[PDB]
């Protein structure tokens, strides 16, 4: 019973405090509508978490193509328009001499 630990208790005053600190840390997140400063619903804690996780790990197609161009030297044009779309694709061919 020496190994067993008490599960801590976290209160919305605390969570809201921290969320504010995050708000100040990344202003553009609140700006672009990633997260909101208010904790109203019971599920908004988790919800903002998931929104963060998506903003961080989701890469827009144009950004993906450019990044893959940089260090992997993936060749091709890359559309910066709204009406253009970057499709990552394979090209096979044969060579014989």
């Amino acid at each position: 019973n020496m190994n067993v630990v008490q599960r801590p208790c976290i209160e919305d005053g605390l969570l809201s405090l921290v969320l504010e600190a995050v708000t100040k840390r990344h202003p553009n997140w609140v700006k672009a509508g990633v997260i909101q400063t208010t904790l109203k619903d019971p599920f908004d804690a988790l919800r903002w978490m998931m929104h963060i996780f998506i903003r961080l790990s989701y890469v827009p197609h144009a950004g993906a193509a450019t990044i893959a161009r940089l260090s992997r030297r993936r060749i091709g044009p890359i559309g910066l328009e709204p009406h253009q779309f970057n499709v990552p694709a394979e090209l096979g061919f044969v060579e014989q001499y």
């Binding site: 060749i75 091709g76 044009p77 060579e95």
Partner: protein
């Protein structure tokens, strides 16, 4: 090069030596079309219709 038993006493290299690769490689030219660089895009309209 330093090996005086080379083909005479029966030593035949199993791996072709670095020097020789360097030479064979140095002799022939490299085709320019083999570089494969496209930064523009595909030419939809003109390319397939180009001069006869």
């Amino acid at each position: 090069s330093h090996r005086r038993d080379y083909i005479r006493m029966g030593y035949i290299p199993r791996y072709t030596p670095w020097e020789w690769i360097a030479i064979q490689e140095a002799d022939q030219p490299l085709i320019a079309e083999q570089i494969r660089q496209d930064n523009i895009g595909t030419s939809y309209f003109f390319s397939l219709n180009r001069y006869w």
